[PDB]
Amino acid sequence: DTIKIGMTSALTGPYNEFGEGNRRAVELAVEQWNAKGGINGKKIEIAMLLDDQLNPDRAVQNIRAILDNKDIVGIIGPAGSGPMLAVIDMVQADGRPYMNPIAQTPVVTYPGEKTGEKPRPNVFSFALQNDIEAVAMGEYLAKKFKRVGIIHESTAYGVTGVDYLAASIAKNGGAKPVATDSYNQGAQDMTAQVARMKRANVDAIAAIGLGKDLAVLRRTMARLNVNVPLAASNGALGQPYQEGAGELTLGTLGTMIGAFGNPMRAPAADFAKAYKAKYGTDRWWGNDPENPQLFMAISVSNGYDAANILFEGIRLANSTDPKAVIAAIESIKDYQGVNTAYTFSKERHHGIETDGVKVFEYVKKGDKIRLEPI
């Protein structure tokens, strides 16, 4: 028989770069492990694959349906702080191994608010956490800019992200942000928010949120003739950003998981080869056939690392018993993942650290705007 896993994520809708990218990631992994026998001779199947569109209510309905199935031995959870936090108690109760690929809110994994101390026992995160992200972004802004304005989405991703970022700015001796506010995902009117910035004479605007929404922010900026550097979070720089913003992406900068920047580590380099072999120069690869785009780390290979690690836990436990698998994953030290080396412990359930992140900026060559290392 088989190893059955469940998965729900934003497969359709405004934020489907995450869910569908992660879906692709997991399928490829399954194939790879499957080509060589499965996990200790047991073929892996994604028995339940569900779409929540990044909606928290749908996530719950989807996780309810997955948990109900007794044959599922593990889960790749949804993209989004909303979906994740919404389902997190149901999952912690059930107690089967649960991979958080994307959601950056620290309490998702460490309810005790101490990163690397007292995690939810069955939750393993492949996110770039907000407090971790705040370090690089905090530093860059606190040295480059005088009055920063911050805008963020209303979910925990935006909420925590800002407290982590404002603080990281203070810590690097930068001045407290001259303007702040939240929007709710989907919000079309940010003129209100971009006007507060414009009137606050910001040096720059830092945004924590997602591509579709970031694009609106930037278009609102040009509409209000507020043209200053836009410093985005990793998740903001997705495909919808550039499609919505077009050539106005020039001058947007961001912190990003750097797995696909040159020079790549071997496993990032090898993954890229397998990905193109399977999917081609697709939406996630991007429009350079020679170079996979940077955003793949947060849209695809986190899903990849999550799958491979879950499978590795099973391989090492020699069972599908949750508590066992949980323990096994904790055995895994020095795992060379695509996005980072993984070294879990009974108390450390995340992997990515600042060395996996750099600051990039949209710059142009000829008539072509490219992300490049700061």
Q: Which residues in this chain contact Na ion in the complex, by CB under 5 A? A: 281
Establish whether 81 is an annotated binding residue: yes
Q: How far is the CB of 241 from Na ion (least distance, A)?
A: 15
Q: Which is nearer to Na ion, 288 or 355 (CB)?
A: 288
DSSP 129-194: -HHHHHHHHHHHHHHH-SSEEEEEESSHHHHHHHHHHHHHHHHTTPPPPSEEEEE-TT----HHHH
Tokens of 258: 């750097």
- Tally Cβ neighbours within 10 Å of residue 222: 12
Q: Which is nearer to Na ion, 281 or 343 (CB)?
A: 281
Smallest separation, CB 271 to Na ion (Å): 17
Q: Quick one: tokens of 274?
A: 């397998």
Which element (helix H / strand E) includes 100? strand 98-100
CB of 289 to Na ion, least distance (A): 8
Query: Which CB atom, from 168 or from 293, has the smaller least distance to Na ion?
Result: 293
**What residue has token string 């961001």?**
254
Q: How far apart (Å, rounded) are the C-alpha atoms in residues 340 and 101?
A: 13
Q: Provide CB contacts within 8 A for 334, sequence distance 6+.
A: 341, 342, 343
Smaller CB separation from Na ion, 279 or 335: 279
**Which residue has its beta carbon closest to Na ion?**
281
- CA gap 268, 337 in Å, rounded: 8
Residue 154, annotated as binding a ligand: no
Let me know: does 218 contact 247? Beta carbons within 8 Å.
no
Minimum CB separation of residue 40 from Na ion in Å reads 37
Contact 123, 108 (CB under 8 A): yes
Q: How far is the CB of 215 from Na ion (least distance, A)?
A: 18
User: b/e string for 351-374 if b means 16 or more Cβ within 10 A?
Assistant: bbeeebbbbbbbbeeeeebbbeee
Q: Which amino acid does the sequence have at 32?
A: Q
Q: How far is the CB of 79 from Na ion (least distance, A)?
A: 21
Nearer to Na ion by C-beta: 276 or 315?
276
- Give 323 or 370: the residue with its C-beta nearer to Na ion: 370
Point out the annotated binding site for 3-hydroxybenzoate.
81, 104, 157
